[PDB]
Design a binder for this molecule. Sequence first.
Ligand SMILES: COc1ccc2[nH]c(-c3ccccc3)c(CCNC(C)=O)c2c1
Ligand SMILES: COc1ccc2[nH]c(-c3ccccc3)c(CCNC(C)=O)c2c1
Ligand SMILES: [Zn+2]
Lengths: 394, 448
Amino acid sequence: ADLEDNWETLNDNLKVIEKADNAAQVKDALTKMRAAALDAQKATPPKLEDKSPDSPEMKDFRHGFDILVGQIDDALKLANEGKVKEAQAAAEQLKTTRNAYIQKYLGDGARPSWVAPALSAVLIVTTAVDVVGNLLVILSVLRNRKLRNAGNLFLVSLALANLVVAFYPYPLILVAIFYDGWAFGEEHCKASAFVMGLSVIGSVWNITAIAIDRYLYICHSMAYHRIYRRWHTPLHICLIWLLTVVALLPNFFVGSLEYDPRIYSCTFIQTASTQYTAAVVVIHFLLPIAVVSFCYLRIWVLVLQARLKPSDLRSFLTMFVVFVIFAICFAPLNCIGLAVAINPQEMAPQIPEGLFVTSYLLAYFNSCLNPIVYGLLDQNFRREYKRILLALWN
Amino acid sequence: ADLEDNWETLNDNLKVIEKADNAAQVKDALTKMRAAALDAQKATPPKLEDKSPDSPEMKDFRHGFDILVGQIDDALKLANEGKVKEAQAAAEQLKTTRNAYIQKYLGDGARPSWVAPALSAVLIVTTAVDVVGNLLVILSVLRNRKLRNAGNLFLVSLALANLVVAFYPYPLILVAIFYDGWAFGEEHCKASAFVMGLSVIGSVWNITAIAIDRYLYICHSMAYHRIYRRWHTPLHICLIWLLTVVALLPNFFVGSLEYDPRIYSCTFIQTASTQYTAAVVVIHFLLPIAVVSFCYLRIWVLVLQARMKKYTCTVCGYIYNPEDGDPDNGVNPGTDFKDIPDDWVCPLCGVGKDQFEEVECLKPSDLRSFLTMFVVFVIFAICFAPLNCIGLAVAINPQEMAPQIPEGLFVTSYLLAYFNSCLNPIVYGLLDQNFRREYKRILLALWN
Ligand SMILES: COc1ccc2[nH]c(-c3ccccc3)c(CCNC(C)=O)c2c1
Ligand SMILES: COc1ccc2[nH]c(-c3ccccc3)c(CCNC(C)=O)c2c1
Ligand SMILES: [Zn+2]
């Protein structure tokens, strides 16, 4: 039997012992566990495959199994006596506890089998739709005199924020999944973690700048037309990106950019400094999500009081949906970060790995959604996407 | 303008409204449609040519146009307001009435009398064996944990490709034969046509994924085992199905999913865009048929050379398995017997490799059933080679080569292609001993 296959066997019967109602169900499960333990001990690990069978690295895995075999025999000594709870306790609090004391028996039970293929599928799809999708957005906005419309600079600003992350950190996390551990230097670690901070942080500030601009243009159009914009807009875009770089610099002093084995990515660590992460969740999420929720509620009340035409909603509809799609995508992880920011000594271990990865899978997915919402809601973008593709077939 | 000519005009502008990006493109198409409707109303139908101009049969066609002109005016009332999707939708309610009320008079309904009973017989039999047959393969693979891990996780994926089509488009077509024309909405039309595209396209990528899998397992055995798999193949299966959905999306922009009266089925149209169909025939048939013919040529050369054969011991009877090796005495799994050094001995009696003879006859279950899998590939190719040839001939020159495709031949190509949805569970049962055993275990448990 295969080592990866035998690893699944020992964990499946471990789950059975918990959901068991009688000592015979337990004694049956503990027999399959001891048999699959001795088979996997005869097998060679993948990381230490080149190492000697007597080497201090390969003989460490062999010995780890010897401890659990005796622990299983100890547990079935109780299950034979008809003591169900007594053996059910000697299973979970001994097969897992000594696994951390054996190290190599703790790695398989740390991460679920599903995160590696789910993450890699999500990143492949996200990177693919990102490059094509946002590259179309760039080209659509560049043609003829389209750039003379200032607001189109915000679509190029967000297109690059989405884009840059697909060209540097996303490809290397995919190498980190297939190599099981970060395969590049400590240089590329903090640098990949930084550009993702630029994208995720830089995006909310563009999304906010838009919400204020579209708030004044619709609600106080008298005062809005009095104030210029043709040159104001490229100044505002430039300012938010330098503002972003500044907000990210405490990461190098507080040491919060390091590789997270749970998500195979070098990213920002919420436990490294609960002071910085508390500010990151407030000042760079709940603060902007609040002001923009306010901006767009004032716009929707005037539309509700105006009732209509498909060309009348055109001014903001596309930009409102992108904001909402952003909020959903980043609300879960910001909640995890908030719970850790209050009391990490007790609330942090209560965050399951299954939930944590689910928060990062959505947050990564957001890097490709924008051109889709443009295609589904904007007729003029849908037309533009068709023109570019036709240009390539003709 | 001629009545047959005006019927082509109203259907051409109907296609334009779908592929339209602005209300003006729609308002322009709806104006040409109303004009061509009033011209055809002034014309006499061919079936009711002998009838009186005021007769209840001839005045029925005149009134049918009055309704269509009213709803065209209703649709352009939306297109003037700048509501594109709202009028694009109200142009489908116009597509139904023009195909339920105006399909009565005119039209060349020249089909042979056999295309109805043959098609319906083939579909009934195909659907029946498809459901039972592939439901057995799904069951036997998840049931037996050993045969599942033998690279046969793509077989459940292939079987789901065969199944899905028996549950939605095949039953509908059968209603389309007994009702003589598509009896369901335009919604269920392009949708049923999509579900078939998923199966036929997804199957070749499933069949390719296995051909590569067995190619590396047999030819690059050493490097193979070095690379993980438990999480690799569910990622590969997931990738092929998204790959497939992607390849099918141009159908909604080029408008190639519509009902074909010759085959009573809403399917993909080869003439709607010869650019897309040329790619469909190349990228999704001749390209994969080529790479897999390459995969199986490099396997068959090893078999001919005897480079991956089992060796039975002429003394204690121990059989050497290249898939297994002799790991405890240094020969890691995947090693060929001809590659073991001379100092190796039988691990059961100590006789030298010197006194080992090869198993002459290679069973189809061997080397992850490469023989059974190769057969399925060949069957698939025969089943879809004719229609892909028709599609290729139409893709070059459709102005002259397309009318030269007889209806009798075209339906014959679709009859085989439909039949392919049920065959593979049979080829597994006839050639794989372990599947035949599993089939019996399923049948005997439900019976007893
Ligand atoms: C402040 O310095 C950095 C620096 C790097 C960062 N990378 C990410 C991130 C990247 C991709 C997907 C989700 C989050 C955050 C945002 C992380 N937010 C929370 C609440 O943990 C981040 C922040
Ligand atoms: C490309 O988008 C679609 C979309 C739907 C499709 N349905 C079928 C098909 C279904 C059952 C039997 C035979 C063909 C093809 C395959 C059609 N291939 C050719 C050469 O015409 C198909 C393709
Ligand atoms: Zn022997």
